[PDB]
Design a protein around this ligand. Structure first.
Ligand code: ERT
Ligand code: ERT
Ligand code: SAH
Ligand code: SAH
Lengths: 340, 340
C-alpha cells in the first residue's frame, strides 16, 4: 500500500508537469549548457528570484531532469538534455507555455466540463476556438506550424514509403502544413506532382519551405477552405493530422469533399493515429485523443469507428498500417480509403 | 534515446493528473464499487456524456487505475481503489477540484510567474489571496479544514506523545485548526489546559469538535489574529503547519508574537515537514514546498534555514524529534524552540 499510494500521488501531481514546463519556458537547460551552472548565474540569465529558482531546481533534481556535479552547480541528466533547444525532438518548444501547444493545455484545467458536455474547453479560456485564435494571433500560428513540422524532413518518409505511387500522377495534400508530406512524396516518386492546400499564413511558410527544398516546380501551394469544394481533382488525397481536429459530422464533410475530388481509381490516405478498440487502452492513443477533446472537440478514432466514418463518406477502409516515428517514441497510423 | 524521451513526456504531461483529479471529482471509483461497472451506468450516475466518459476511462486504464474484466465492465486496480471516498489516506477528496487544495493547485499553471516574483499565483486566478478567498466562501473554508484534519484522530498522537508535558499548565495552539492537536494533548496529559486560536468559520468547527469530544472545559477556542499580540500566556505554544504559510518576514513576526507570550521556562513547538538541505532534494519536500510558494508565497524551511529564522525572533532550536506518519508515507518533525 505504500507503493500504491505514492503511485497515485505521482500520477495525480500537477506541480511536476508544470515544473518541467517552466524549466522549458525559462530555457534553463540551454542556459546551463552555455556556462551558467549556479543558481545565481541562472537567476541572472532568466531574470528570476534566486531563492525561488533554487526551489524549482530542487524539484528538477528530485525527478531526474538535473543533477548536482559540484557544490551548487547543476547539470542536465540525459533526460534534461532533451530540453536543449537544438535537440531534434524539439521537446523544449513543445513544453513552452508561450508556444501554441503547451498554452493550449491550460484547457485541461476544465476537463470535467469537457467530459460532462463533450465540448472543447479552449475557447472558455482564450476567447476564441482553437483555429480562430491562431488566425487572430499570427505569432501563435507560426509557433503551432513549426511545432507540428519540427520533424518535417523525416516524419513523412515512412508513410510515403508505405504507399505505392505507380498509379499516381497528381497529389492533393488537404491541410498539408508546411508541405512536408507532399515534399517527401515528391522526393520518393519523381513522376508525381502535388498541391498543398492550407490556411492563410501557413501557405506562405509552406511555399518558402518548398522553395528551400528545390521543389517549387513540382509542388504547388493554394490558400483555401477544405469544407468547400476542393480546387483540384487528384489521384491521391492526403489528410495528415486533419480529421482528428473535428467531430464526426465535420470529419465526414471533409472526407466527402475529398471523395468528390477523387480521380477514377483514386485513394485518400489518412495519416494520424488509430487503434483497434481492444488495443486502444494505451498512453499514446489517449494522450492525443484527449488533447483533441479539450482543444477542439475532435477525437482519435478506433479502427472500428473508421469503418463507420469511411462509409458515411462513400468510402471503404482498404488497409491500415502502423508506422514508427523516427524522432519520438510514438506510432502513427496510415489508413488507405477507396471510393465505394 | 527512446526511454529518456518517454520519461520526459510522461513527466511533462498535464492530461494525466487532470484525468486523475476529474475521476476523483466525479466519484468514479465509488460509483463503480456501488455496482455501476459499464460506461453506460457510470455516465448516467455522473451526468457525463457516455462517449467522452469512455475516453476518460480509456486513460484511467492505460495509467493503471482501472481495468476491464467482463466486456465493457471496469473495476478499480490496487491504485484506483485509493480513490474510494472512505479510504484512510482520503486521496479522493485531496484530488477533488471542488475542494480547496486541488482547486488551489490550478495555481501551478502559472508557476513561471511564481519563480520570477517569489509570490503566490492563487489570487491571479481566483480573485483573492488564499485565506481571504476561504473567508468569503464557507464552502471552501470547511473543505480545507476537513482536508487538513482528515487524519484528525491519529495525526497528532505521535507529536503529543513525544513531548514532556509535566511542567506545562497551559498550551496555546496558534492557528490550531479544528483543535485536533490540542485534544490529543489534553487526552495524554489530563492536568493541562489549552487555548486554540483560529479564524472565523474554523472557530465554530473547532468548538463543535471539542464539544463532541467532551473537552469544552479543558480546551477553549478564541477567534483572533496571530499577527496581533496573543490573547494569553502559556508554557508551550504550538505552530503546527502554520509558519510554512508565510514568507520569512511574516513567519518571524509570528514567532516573535509567540516568544512574547511565553512564560519563564516555556518552549514553542513547530510541527512541520523539514529536512537538512543536502537531503531536501526529494519529492516529499518539494511537493509541499512548491504548493506553499504558489498558494501563499510560503515555504518549507530546511534545518539550516530554521536556525536563522529562530535567531531573528530571539530563539534557538534546542531539539528536533523525527515523527513517523501513520496515514500517508510522509515524514514530519517536531522542532522545539527556546529563547536564546
Ligand atoms: C508527444 C506525442 C505527440 O508529439 C504526437 C503527435 O505529434 C507527432 C506528429 C507531428 N506532426 C507531423 C504533426 C510531428 O511529426 C511530431 C514529432 O509527432 C502530436 C500531434 O500530432 C498533435 C498534437 C500533439 O500534441 C502531438 C504530440 C502529443 O500527442 O503529445 C501528447 C497536438 O497537440 C495538436 C493540437 C492541435 C491540433 C493538432 O492537429 C494538427 C495537434 C496534433 O496533430
Ligand atoms: C500528500 C501529502 C500531504 O498530505 C502532506 C501534508 O499533510 C500532512 C499533514 C496534515 N496535518 C497534520 C495537518 C494531515 O495529517 C495530512 C494527512 O498529512 C500536506 C500539508 O500539510 C498541507 C498541504 C498538502 O498538500 C499536504 C500534502 C502534500 O504534500 O500534497 C502534495 C497543502 O496543500 C496545504 C495548502 C495550504 C495550506 C496548508 O497548510 C495550512 C497546507 C498544508 O499544510
Ligand atoms: N477549414 C480549413 N481549411 C484548410 N485547412 C484547415 C482548415 N482548418 C484547419 N486547417 C489546417 O489543417 C492543419 C492541421 S495540422 C497540420 C497537419 C500537417 N498535414 C501535418 O501532418 O503535419 C493546420 O495546419 C490548419 O491550417
Ligand atoms: N492571521 C491569522 N490568524 C490566526 N490563524 C490564521 C491566520 N491566518 C491563517 N491562519 C490559519 O492557520 C491554519 C493553518 S493550517 C494548520 C492547522 C493545524 N495546526 C494543523 O496542523 O492541521 C489555518 O487553519 C488558518 O485558519
Amino acid at each position: 500500500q505504500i507503493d500504491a499510494l505514492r503511485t497515485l500521488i505521482r500520477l495525480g501531481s500537477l506541480h511536476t508537469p508544470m515544473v518541467v514546463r517552466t524549466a522549458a519556458t525559462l530555457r534553463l537547460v540551454d542556459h546551463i549548457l552555455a556556462g551558467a551552472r549556479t543558481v545565481k548565474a541562472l537567476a541572472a540569465r532568466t531574470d528570476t528570484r534566486p531563492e525561488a529558482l533554487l526551489r524549482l531546481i530542487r524539484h528538477l533534481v528530485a525527478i531526474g531532469l538535473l543533477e548536482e556535479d559540484a557544490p551548487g552547480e547543476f547539470v542536465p541528466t540525459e533526460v534534461g538534455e532533451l530540453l536543449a533547444d537544438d535537440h531534434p525532438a524539439a521537446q523544449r518548444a513543445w513544453h513552452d507555455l508561450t508556444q501554441a501547444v503547451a498554452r493550449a493545455d491550460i484547457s485541461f484545467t476544465r476537463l470535467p466540463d469537457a467530459i460532462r458536455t463533450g465540448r472543447p474547453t479552449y475557447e472558455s479560456i482564450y476567447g476564441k476556438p482553437f483555429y480562430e485564435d491562431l488566425a487572430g494571433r499570427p505569432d501563435l500560428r507560426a509557433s503551432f506550424d513549426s511545432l507540428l513540422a519540427c520533424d518535417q524532413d523525416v516524419a513523412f518518409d515512412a508513410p510515403a514509403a508505405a504507399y505505392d505511387w505507380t498509379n499516381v500522377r497528381h497529389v492533393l495534400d488537404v491541410g498539408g502544413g508546411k508541405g512536408g508530406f507532399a515534399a517527401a512524396i515528391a522526393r520518393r516518386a519523381p513522376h508525381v506532382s502535388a498541391t498543398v492546400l492550407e490556411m492563410a499564413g501557413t501557405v506562405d511558410t509552406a511555399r518558402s519551405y518548398l522553395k528551400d527544398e528545390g521543389l517549387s516546380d513540382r509542388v504547388d501551394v493554394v490558400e483555401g477552405d477544405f469544407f468547400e469544394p476542393l480546387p483540384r481533382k487528384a489521384d491521391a488525397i492526403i489528410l495528415s493530422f486533419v480529421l482528428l481536429n473535428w467531430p464526426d459530422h465535420d470529419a465526414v464533410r471533409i472526407l466527402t469533399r475529398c471523395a468528390e475530388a477523387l480521380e477514377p481509381g483514386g485513394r485518400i490516405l489518412i495519416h494520424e493515429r488509430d487503434d483497434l478498440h481492444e488495443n486502444s487502452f494505451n498512453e499514446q492513443f489517449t494522450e492525443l485523443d484527449l488533447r483533441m477533446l479539450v482543444f477542439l472537440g475532435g477525437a482519435l478514432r478506433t479502427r472500428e469507428k473508421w469503418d463507420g466514418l469511411a462509409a458515411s463518406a462513400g468510402l471503404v477502409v482498404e488497409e491500415v498500417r502502423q508506422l514508427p516515428s523516427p524522432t519520438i517514441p510514438y506510432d502513427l497510423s496510415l489508413l488507405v480509403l477507396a471510393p465505394a
